Scaffold this active site. Structure first.
Site, short mmCIF file in Angstrom:
data_model
loop_
_atom_site.label_atom_id
_atom_site.label_comp_id
_atom_site.label_asym_id
_atom_site.label_seq_id
_atom_site.Cartn_x
_atom_site.Cartn_y
_atom_site.Cartn_z
N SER A 186 -5.63 7.08 1.15
CA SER A 186 -5.41 8.36 1.82
C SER A 186 -5.92 9.51 0.98
O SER A 186 -5.99 9.39 -0.25
CB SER A 186 -3.93 8.55 2.14
OG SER A 186 -3.19 9.21 1.12
N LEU A 221 0.81 -1.21 0.00
CA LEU A 221 0.00 0.00 0.00
C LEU A 221 0.85 1.28 0.00
O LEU A 221 0.42 2.29 -0.55
CB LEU A 221 -1.03 -0.02 1.15
CG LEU A 221 -2.17 -1.06 1.02
CD1 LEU A 221 -2.96 -1.19 2.31
CD2 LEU A 221 -3.12 -0.72 -0.12
N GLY A 222 2.06 1.19 0.57
CA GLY A 222 3.00 2.31 0.63
C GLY A 222 4.11 2.20 1.65
O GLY A 222 4.48 1.11 2.09
N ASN A 242 -2.66 10.66 6.40
CA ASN A 242 -3.05 10.04 7.67
C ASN A 242 -4.55 10.22 7.89
O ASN A 242 -5.02 10.07 9.02
CB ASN A 242 -2.23 10.62 8.84
CG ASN A 242 -0.76 10.34 8.80
OD1 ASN A 242 -0.30 9.35 8.23
ND2 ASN A 242 0.02 11.19 9.43
N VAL A 254 6.51 0.50 6.69
CA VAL A 254 6.02 0.05 5.38
C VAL A 254 4.64 -0.61 5.58
O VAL A 254 4.47 -1.40 6.51
CB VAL A 254 7.06 -0.86 4.69
CG1 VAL A 254 6.54 -1.38 3.35
CG2 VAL A 254 8.36 -0.10 4.49
N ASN A 288 7.97 7.43 6.43
CA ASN A 288 8.73 6.20 6.27
C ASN A 288 9.02 5.54 7.62
O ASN A 288 8.30 5.79 8.59
CB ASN A 288 10.01 6.44 5.43
CG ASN A 288 10.39 5.29 4.52
OD1 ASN A 288 9.58 4.40 4.23
ND2 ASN A 288 11.63 5.28 4.06
N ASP A 324 0.25 14.38 14.03
CA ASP A 324 0.55 14.42 12.59
C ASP A 324 -0.70 14.30 11.68
O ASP A 324 -0.90 13.30 10.98
CB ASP A 324 1.64 13.41 12.15
CG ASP A 324 2.33 13.81 10.85
OD1 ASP A 324 3.02 12.95 10.25
OD2 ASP A 324 2.18 14.98 10.43
N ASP A 370 8.46 8.71 20.27
CA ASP A 370 9.87 9.00 20.46
C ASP A 370 10.77 8.28 19.44
O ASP A 370 11.41 8.95 18.62
CB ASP A 370 10.31 8.68 21.91
CG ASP A 370 9.62 9.52 23.00
OD1 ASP A 370 9.56 10.77 22.84
OD2 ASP A 370 9.21 8.93 24.02
N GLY A 426 -0.70 9.57 17.74
CA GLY A 426 0.27 9.21 18.77
C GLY A 426 -0.30 8.57 20.01
O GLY A 426 -0.35 9.21 21.07
N1 LIG Z 1 -5.32 1.34 6.99
C1 LIG Z 1 -4.97 1.65 5.69
N2 LIG Z 1 -5.79 1.36 4.64
C2 LIG Z 1 -5.46 1.67 3.39
N3 LIG Z 1 -4.31 2.28 3.12
C3 LIG Z 1 -3.43 2.63 4.09
C4 LIG Z 1 -3.73 2.32 5.44
N4 LIG Z 1 -2.68 2.76 6.20
C5 LIG Z 1 -1.78 3.31 5.45
N5 LIG Z 1 -2.19 3.25 4.14
C6 LIG Z 1 -1.49 3.78 2.99
O1 LIG Z 1 -0.07 3.62 3.13
C7 LIG Z 1 0.55 4.82 2.65
C8 LIG Z 1 1.88 4.98 3.39
O2 LIG Z 1 1.73 4.73 4.79
P1 LIG Z 1 2.54 5.56 5.90
O3 LIG Z 1 3.76 4.77 6.58
O4 LIG Z 1 1.66 5.95 7.02
O5 LIG Z 1 3.11 6.87 5.20
P2 LIG Z 1 2.66 8.40 5.16
O6 LIG Z 1 1.18 8.50 5.79
O7 LIG Z 1 2.65 8.86 3.73
N6 LIG Z 1 3.75 9.28 6.10
P3 LIG Z 1 3.70 8.98 7.77
O8 LIG Z 1 2.25 8.43 8.19
O9 LIG Z 1 4.00 10.37 8.51
O10 LIG Z 1 4.78 8.08 8.26
C9 LIG Z 1 -0.43 5.98 2.95
O11 LIG Z 1 -0.38 7.00 1.93
C10 LIG Z 1 -1.79 5.28 2.86
O12 LIG Z 1 -2.36 5.53 1.57
O1 LIG Z 2 2.37 5.16 12.26
C1 LIG Z 2 2.67 6.00 13.09
C2 LIG Z 2 2.35 5.83 14.56
C3 LIG Z 2 3.11 6.56 15.47
C4 LIG Z 2 2.88 6.51 16.84
C5 LIG Z 2 1.88 5.68 17.31
F1 LIG Z 2 1.68 5.57 18.64
C6 LIG Z 2 1.15 4.91 16.42
F2 LIG Z 2 0.20 4.13 16.95
C7 LIG Z 2 1.32 5.01 15.03
N1 LIG Z 2 0.58 4.27 14.14
C8 LIG Z 2 -0.78 4.04 14.12
C9 LIG Z 2 -1.68 4.63 15.01
C10 LIG Z 2 -3.03 4.32 15.00
C11 LIG Z 2 -3.52 3.42 14.04
I1 LIG Z 2 -5.59 3.02 13.98
C12 LIG Z 2 -2.64 2.84 13.12
C13 LIG Z 2 -1.28 3.13 13.17
F3 LIG Z 2 -0.45 2.57 12.27
N2 LIG Z 2 3.36 7.14 12.64
C14 LIG Z 2 2.96 8.55 12.87
C15 LIG Z 2 3.49 8.95 11.52
O2 LIG Z 2 2.44 9.55 10.75
C16 LIG Z 2 4.81 9.74 11.50
C17 LIG Z 2 5.94 9.20 12.43
C18 LIG Z 2 7.21 10.05 12.34
C19 LIG Z 2 6.94 11.56 12.50
C20 LIG Z 2 5.77 12.07 11.65
N3 LIG Z 2 4.62 11.18 11.77
C21 LIG Z 2 3.63 7.48 11.22
MG LIG Z 3 0.42 7.54 7.54
#
Ligand SMILES: Nc1ncnc2c1ncn2[C@@H]1O[C@H](COP(=O)(O)OP(=O)(O)NP(=O)(O)O)[C@@H](O)[C@H]1O
Ligand SMILES: O=C(c1ccc(F)c(F)c1Nc1ccc(I)cc1F)N1CC(O)([C@@H]2CCCCN2)C1
Ligand SMILES: [Mg+2]
Length: 292
Positions: free
Chosen positions: A90, A14-15, A135, A21, A18, A130, A157, A150
């Protein structure tokens, strides 16, 4: 049921973005399609246990505006967060296809972000940290849900941080120091809505000729200096209702105490108007991104 690595099967990726993954997976014993996010971390066994322990509160994060959670576990140097698969992806992805997201649709999104944030705050005493289009997730049932909030301080952290550099959704106060809290999320939403409304990251703002056509990139310091010292971004007049214009303005006030809070926005003219609106977001989404 407890989730374990060997019970999953990759469907597609899906992406990334970073550290973490995310793949579309089949949980072989349930038959469910989930989105599994793996976060590679070089961390001691005691604090990765803390991360998993803290993530268990996601089982108690149930709201129509919050992405569903299935379970959290540690595999092979990676912590897995297994969640609801949002078949619409997203808002960053739908904006790529749409080019520009309409005001009425953005009203439905705004309602979901405020209600999503209100839930996390009222019910769990947690801030998003964030709020940005990637997101904010959507689906074919017309659902608009938040994720990547968060919930675990230790995870917050351990994952760091500044992976931008042509787009920062960080509030001027968060960019400037430690003097930030829940008001930061208001700014992030405000900035995100201007981006989706205009069809591009709104910094630097577009000139007279740029706006006319619609209706090299920036250096890290140039962009951050713009955010903290230059006047905040605005929605262009005429093309958007005065109600939306005032709403984003309230969100993008540089002073976080002057800035509107969830309470105020929840009763804003724009929200009140969007709540009344009869919008088939599901139908709009599928027709623009290619689904139903
Ligand atoms: N629960 C989900 N269902 C469908 N697609 C998802 C889901 N979670 C994440 N994605 C996809 O995965 C892509 C990348 O995930 P992600 O690691 O969260 O990167 P990001 O949102 O672009 N930056 P960040 O969240 O700050 O780390 C996102 O653009 C979403 O489109
Ligand atoms: O994926 C996350 C993330 C960070 C902290 C946390 F406590 C989490 F639970 C996180 N993931 C998350 C939360 C709720 C659901 I429902 C599903 C999940 F995968 N991080 C935050 C993020 O957007 C980045 C991390 C680095 C700094 C900028 N934001 C990616
Ligand atoms: Mg994300």
């Amino acid at each position: 049921m407890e989730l374990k690595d060997d019970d999953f099967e990759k469907i597609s990726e899906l992406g990334a973005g970073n550290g973490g993954v995310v793949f579309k997976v089949s949980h072989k014993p349930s038959g469910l399609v989930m989105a599994r996010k793996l976060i590679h971390l070089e961390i001691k066994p005691a604090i990765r246990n803390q991360i998993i322990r803290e993530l268990q509160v996601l089982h108690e994060c149930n709201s129509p505006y919050i992405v569903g959670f299935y379970g959290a576990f540690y595999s092979d140097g990676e912590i897995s967060i297994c969640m609801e698969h949002m078949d619409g992806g997203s808002l960053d992805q739908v904006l790529k296809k749409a080019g520009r997201i309409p005001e009425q649709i953005l009203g439905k999104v705004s309602i979901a972000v405020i209600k999503g944030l209100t839930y996390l705050r009222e019910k769990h005493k947690i801030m998003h940290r964030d709020v940005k289009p990637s997101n904010i997730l959507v689906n074919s049932r017309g659902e608009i849900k938040l994720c990547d909030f968060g919930v675990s301080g230790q995870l917050i952290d351990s994952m760091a941080n500044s992976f931008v550099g042509t787009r920062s959704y960080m509030s001027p106060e968060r960019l400037q120091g430690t003097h930030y809290s829940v008001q930061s999320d208001i700014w992030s939403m405000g900035l995100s809505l201007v981006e989706m409304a205009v069809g591009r990251y709104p910094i630097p703002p577009p000139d007279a000729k740029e706006l006319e056509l619609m209706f090299p990139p920036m250096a890290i310091f140039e962009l951050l200096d713009y955010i903290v010292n230059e006047p905040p971004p605005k929605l262009p007049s005429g093309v958007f209702s005065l109600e939306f214009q005032d709403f984003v303005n309230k969100c993008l006030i540089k002073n976080p105490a002057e800035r509107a809070d969830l309470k105020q926005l929840m009763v804003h003219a724009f929200i009140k108007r969007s709540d009344a609106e009869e919008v088939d977001f599901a139908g709009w989404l599928c027709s623009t991104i290619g689904l139903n």
